[PDB]
Every structure is written in C-alpha cells, then in structure tokens.
C-alpha cells in the first residue's frame, strides 16, 4: 500500500449555491367542459455546485476489482384519457368580455 | 496497508446553500364540468452544494473487490380517465365578464 | 493495517443551509361539477449542503469485499377515474362577473 | 503502491452557483370543450458548477480492473387520448371581446 | 506504482455559474374545442462550468483494464390522439374583437 | 324656479376601482459615510373613477352669482445640507465582493 | 326657469378603473462617501376614468354670473447642498468584484 | 329659460381604464464620492379616459357672464450644489471586475 | 331660451384606455467622483381617450359673455452646480474588466 | 334661442387608446470624474384619441361675446455648470477590457 496525502492550508472558500425553482410546473389550464391531466414525471436530475472539494478517496491496492454503476429505467405505462361527447359549452377564461352566447335548438 | 493523511489548517469556509422551491406545482386549473388529475411523479433528483468537503475514505488493500451501485425503475401503471358526456355548461374563470349565456332547447 | 490520520486546526465554518419549499403543491383547482384527484407522488430526492465535512472512513484491509447499493422501484398501480354524464352546470371561479346563465329545456 | 500527494495553500475561491428555473413548464392552455394532458417527462439532466475541485481519487494498483458505467432507458408506453364528438362551443380566452355567438338549429 | 503530485499555491478563483432557464416550455396554446397534449421529453443534457478544476485521478498500474461507458435508449412508444368530429365552434383567443358569429342550420 | 328631474330605471353598474400604489417611494439608498434626505413632497393629486354618476345639482335661479374656486401654493423653503470633509471610506453595497481595501498613510 | 330632464333606462356599465403606480420613485442610489437628496415634488396631477357619467348640473337663470377658477403656484425655494472635500474612497456597489484597492500616502 | 333634455336608453358601456406608471423615476445612480440630487418636479398632467360621458350642464340664461379659468406658475428657485475637491477614489459599480487600483503618493 | 335635446339609444361602447409609462426617467448614471442632478421638470401634458362622449353643455342665452382661459408660466430659476477639482479617480461601471490602474506620484 | 338636437342610435364604438411611453428619458450616462445634469423640461403636449365624440356644446345667442384662449411661457433661467480641473482619471464603462492604465508623475 502507498500514501494519499492531502494538505490544505490557508483556504478561504465562500458563496456556494445550488438553486432549483418551479421545475415541471403546470399553470393556468382552464377547460370549459373537462380537464384531464395525467402527471407522471420521472426526475433523476442533478443540480450541483462544488467549490474546493474532493471526491471519494479509495486506497485499494489489489488485482481483480469490479466496479459497476448501473441505472435501468423501463416504461410500459398505459394511459387512456377518453371523453364521449361534448356540446353546448360556453367557456370565457378571458377578462372583460361581454354578450357571449351559445344556443342549441333541436326539433325532432 | 498504507497511509491516508489529510491535514487541514487555517480554513475559513462560509455561505453554502442548497435551495429547492415549488417543483412539480399544478396551479390555476379550473374545469367547467370536471377536473380529473392523476398525480404520480417519481423524484430521485439531487440538489447539492459542496464546499471544502471530501467524500468517503476507504482504505481497503486487497484483491477481489466487487462494488455495485444499481438503480432500477420499472413502470407498468395503468391510468384510465373517462367521462361519458358533457352538455349545457357555462364556465367563466375570467374576471369582469358579463352577459354570458348557454341555452339548450330539445323538442321531441 | 495502515493509518488514516485526519488533522484539523483553526477551522472556522459557518452559514450552511439546506432549504426545500412548496414542492409538489396543487393549488386553485375548482371544478364546476366534480374534482377527482389521485395524489401518489414518490419522493427519494436529496437536498444537501456540505461544508468542511468528510464522508465515511472505512479502514478494512482484506481481499474479497462485496459492497452493493441497490434501489428498485416497481410500479403497477391501476387508477380509474370515471364520471358518467354532466349537464346543466354554471361554474364561475372568476371574480366580478355578472349575468351568467345556463338554461336547459327538454320537451318530450 | 505509489503516492498521490495533493497540496493546496493560500486558495481563495468564491461565487459558485448552479441555477435551474422553470424547466418543462406548461402555461396558459385553455380548451373550450376539453383539455387532455399526459405529462410524462424523464429528466436525467445535470446542471453543475465546479471551482477548484478534484474528482474521485482511486489508488488501485493491480491488473484486471473492470469498470462499467451503464444507463439503459426503454420506452414502450401506450398513450391514447380520445374524444368522440364536439359541437356548439364558444371559447373566448381573449380579453375585451364582445357580441360572440355560436348558434345550432336542427329541424328533423 | 508511481507518483501523482498536484501542487496548488496562491489560487484565486471566482464567478463560476451554470444557469438553465425555461427549457421545453409550452405556453399559450388555446383550443376552441379541444387541446390534446402528450408531453414525454427525455432529457440527458448537461450544463457545466468548470474553473480551475481537475477530473478523476486514477492511479491504477496494471495490465488488463476494461473501462466501458455505455448509454442505450430504446423508444417504442405508441401514441394515439383521436377526435371523431367537430362542428359549430367559435374560438376568439384574440383581444378586442366584436360581432363574431358561427351559425349552423340543418333542416331534414 | 324650474324643474331638474332625473329618472333612473333598470341600471346595473359594477366594477369601479381607483388604485394608487407606491407613489413617491425612495428605496435602496446606501451611503458609505452619510445619507442626508430632506423629504418634503406636496401632493394634491386625484385618482378618480366615476361610473353612472352625476355631479352637484344646484338649482339657483337668480342674478349676481359669484363662484370662485382658488388654490394658491407659495414656496420659500430654505434647505441646506452640508458636510465638511470625508476621507478613508470603504463602501461595499454590492454582493459577493472580496479583497476591497482603502489605505491612508500620512507622515508629517 | 326652465327644465333639465335626464332620463336613464336599461344602462349596464362596468369595468371602470383608474390606476397609478410607482410615480416619482428614486431607487438604487449608492454613494461612496455621501448621498444628499432634497425631495420636494409638487403633484397636482389627475388620473380619471369616467363611464356613463354627467358633470355638475347648474340651473341658474340670471344675468351677472362671475365664475372664476384660479390656481397659482409660486416657487422661491433656496436649496444648497455643499460638501467640502472627499478623498480616499473605495465604492463597490457592483457584484462579484475582487482585489479593488485605493491607496493614499502623504510624506511631508 | 329653455330645456336641456338628455335621454339614454339601452346603453352598455365597459372597459374604461386610465393607467399611469413609473413617471419621473430616477434609478441606478451610483457615485464614487458623492451623489447630490435636488428633486423638485411640478406635475399638473392629466391621464383621462371618457366613455359615454357628458361634461357639465349649465343652464344659465342671462347677459353678462364672466367665466375665467386661470393657472399661473412662477419659478424663482435658487439651487446650488457645490463640492470643493475630490481625489483618490475607486468606484466599481460594474460586475465581475478584478484588480482595480487607485494610488496617490505625495512627497513634500 | 331654446332646447338642447340629446337622445342616445342602443349604444355599446367598450375598450377605452389612456396609458402613460416611464416618462422623464433617469437611469444608469454612474459618476466616478460625483453625480449632481437638479431635477425640476414641469408637466402640464394630457393623455386622453374619448369614446362616445360629449363635452360641456352650456345653455346661456344672453349678450356680453366673457370667457377667458389663461395659462402663464414664468421661469427665473438659478441653478449652479460647481466642483472645484478632481484627481486620481478610477471608475469602472463596465462589466468583466481587469487590471485597471490610476497612479499619481508628486515629488516636491 | 334655437335648438341643438343630437340623436345617436345603434352606435357600437370600441378600441380607443392613447399611449405615451419613455418620453424625455436619460439613460446610460457614465462620467469618469463627474456627471452634472440640470433637468428642467416643460411639457404641455397632448396625446389624444377621439372616437364618435362631440366637443363642447354652447348655445349662447347674443351679441358681444369675447372668448380668449391664451398661453404665455417666459424663460429667463440661469444655469451654470462649472468644474475647475480634472486630472489622472481612468474611466472604463465598456465591458471585457484589460490592462488599462493612467500614470502621472510630477517631479519639482
């Protein structure tokens, strides 16, 4: 075995920040008849800030090392959004509108 | 076996911050008849800030090490959102609207 | 076996913060007839701040180590949101609206 | 085994930031009859900032190392969004509109 | 085994930033009858800033190393968005419009 | 004398708003040595919203009316802001700065 | 005297707004040695919105009316901002600066 | 005296707005030694919106009317901003600057 | 006296707006030694929008009317901005600059 | 006296806007030693939009009318901006500059 000698003297580190905000946001979605949302995100992201930092230190003298990092993601989801029929709908998500009319007359 | 000698003298570290805010937010979703939300996120994310920091220290002299990091994610979810029929709906999520009418007349 | 000698002298560390706020929030979701929410998030996230810090120290001289880190996630959820029929609905989630009418007349 | 000697003296590091904001956002999506959203993003992204930082230190003298980094993503999702019929819809998501009319008259 | 000797003296590093904003955003998508969105992005991107930083240090004297980095992505998703029929729709997402009319009269 | 006959029938008025915000605001004014603020605004402004409203009704039949509206503003203020001398000042109102020095050496 | 007959029937008025914001604002004014602010605005402005509204109604039959609207503003203010001398000042209102120095050496 | 007959029937007025924002704003004014601001605006402006509105109604039959609208503004302000001397000043309001120096050496 | 007969029937007025923004703004004015600002605007401007609106109605039968509209503005302001001497100034309001130096050496 | 008969039937007016923005703006004015600004604008401008609108209605039968509209503006302002001497100034308002030097050496 050998030596792994780290020496740190007179270090002044400051102001390290990792910031994540409003990721995968769904806003302002009006529906006159219906809103169907299937919300299945998968998040393995990384937001990292490293200042004056070392990683892992592994002193492993020897022959025959096996190091395996593995990530497997399999997707067979089945999503079905179904609506039969829509009629006679007035939807006013805007502002300051006036005199909006939807008329249906059926004579059999 | 060998030596792993870390020496730290006169270190001044400060201001390390990890901040996460409002991730995966669903806001302002009106529905005139119905709102169907299936909310199944999977979150393995990392928000990290490292300042003047070491990782793991493993002094393991020897032959035949097996190190395995594994992550497996399998998805076979079945989601079904169904609505039969929608009619005669007035939806006003906006502001300051006036005289909005939906009329249906059926004569059999 | 060898030596793992850590020496720390005259260290001044300060201001380490990890902050998480309002993650996976569902706000302002009105429904005129119905609101169906299935809320099943899975959260394995990490928000970490490390300042002047070491990890694990393992002094294990020897041959034949097996180190396995494993995470498995399997999803076969079955979600069914169903509504038969919707009619004659007035939904006003907005502000300051006036004279909003929904009329249905059926003559058999 | 050999030597891995890192010496750091008189280091002044500062102002390291990783920032992620509003990724994968869906905003302002009105639908007169219906809104069907299937939201399944997969996120393995990285936002990283590194200042004066080393990686992993592996002192492993020996013959026969096997290092495998593997990531596998398989997608067989089945998504079906279906609507049968839409008629007699007035949708006004704009502002300051007036005298908007939709009329249907059927005489059998 | 040999020597890997890194010496750092009198280093002043500052102002390292990685910033990602509003990626994969869907905004302002109105639909008079229907909006069908299937949102399945796959993100393995990297936004990185490196200042005065080393990578991994691997001191591994020996014959027979096998280092394999592999990423495999297979896509067999099946997406079907279907609508049967649309008629008698007025959609005004613009502002300041007036006297917009859609009339259908059927006499059998 | 005559008649002043006002008749109002079937009136529907709504949504009248007068809003004033953050007028004459002084923000973020740092001074390394001194801050001298003399704050003497004179405000006779009007923010008015009138909907379906009459003014004054004066039925005054006769000869010789004198109606005088008068506003007089006279300003003879005397403002004196005085500082004798400033030296040897370091002012850092900014963020994330480092190694800022102000040195004065006098040898008589 | 005569008649002043106002008749209003079937009136629908709405959405009248007068808005004033952040007028006469002083922001972000740093001074390394001194900040001298004399703040004497005079405001007689009007922000008005009138919808379906009458003014004053004056029924004054007669000869010899005198109507005088007068506004007089006289300004003889005396403002004196004085500083004697400034020296040896470092001012850093910016962000992320480093190694900023101001040196004065006097040898008599 | 005569007649002033106003008749209003079936009036629909809406969306009247008067908006004033950020008038006479002073922003981002750094001074290395000094900032002297004398802030004396005079504001008699008007922001008006009129929809379906009458003015004043004056029924004044007679001979000899005198109507005088007068506005007088007289300005004899005396403003004196004085500084005696400035020397040895470093001002860095910009961002991300480095190694900025101001040196004065006097040898009598 | 005669008749002034105004008749309004079936009027639909909308969308009247008067907007004023950021008038007389002073931004981004750095000074290395000094900033002297004398800010005395005089504002009698008008921003007006008129839709379907009448003015004043004056029924004044008679001989000898005197109508005088008068506005008088007299300016005898005395403004004196004075600085005696400036020397040895470094001003860096720009971004990303480096190695900027100002040196004065006097040997009497 | 006679008749002034205005009749308005079936009027539809809309979309009247008066907009003023960023008038008389002073931006990005750096000074290495000094910035002297005397800011005295006089504003009597008009921004007007008129749609379907009448002016004043004056029914004044008679002989001897005197109508006087008068505006008088007199300017005798006295502005004096004075600086005695400037020397040894480095001003870098640009971005990304390097190695900028100003040197003065006096040997008496």
Summarize this structure briefly.
The structure is a homodecamer of 108-residue chains. Helix content of chain A is 0%, strand content 61%.
Could you describe the 3D structure shown?
The PDB classes it as protein fibril. The entry lists the keywords Amyloid fibril, protein fibril. The structure is a homodecamer of 108-residue chains. In chain A, 0% of the residues lie in helices and 61% in strands. The first copy, chain A, is built from no helices and 12 strands. Chain A has strands at residues 3-9, 12-13, 16-21, 26-27, 34-39, 42-43, 46-51, 57-59, 66-75, 78-83, 86-91, 98-107. At the A-B interface, β1, β2, β3, β4 and β5 of A face β1, β2, β3, β4 and β5 of B. β2 (16-21) of chain B pairs parallel with β2 of chain C.
Any chance you could write out the topology, listing elements then pairs?
10 copies of one chain form a homodecamer.
Chain A (H helix, E strand, L loop, with lengths): L2 E7 L2 E2 L2 E6 L4 E2 L6 E6 L2 E2 L2 E6 L5 E3 L6 E10 L2 E6 L2 E6 L6 E10 L1
Organism (chains A, B, C, D, E, F, G, H, I, J): Homo sapiens (Human)
Subcellular location (chains A, B, C, D, E, F, G, H, I, J): Cytoplasm, Cytosol; Cell membrane; Cytoplasm, Cytoskeleton; Cell projection, Axon
Protein name (chains A, B, C, D, E, F, G, H, I, J): Microtubule-associated protein tau
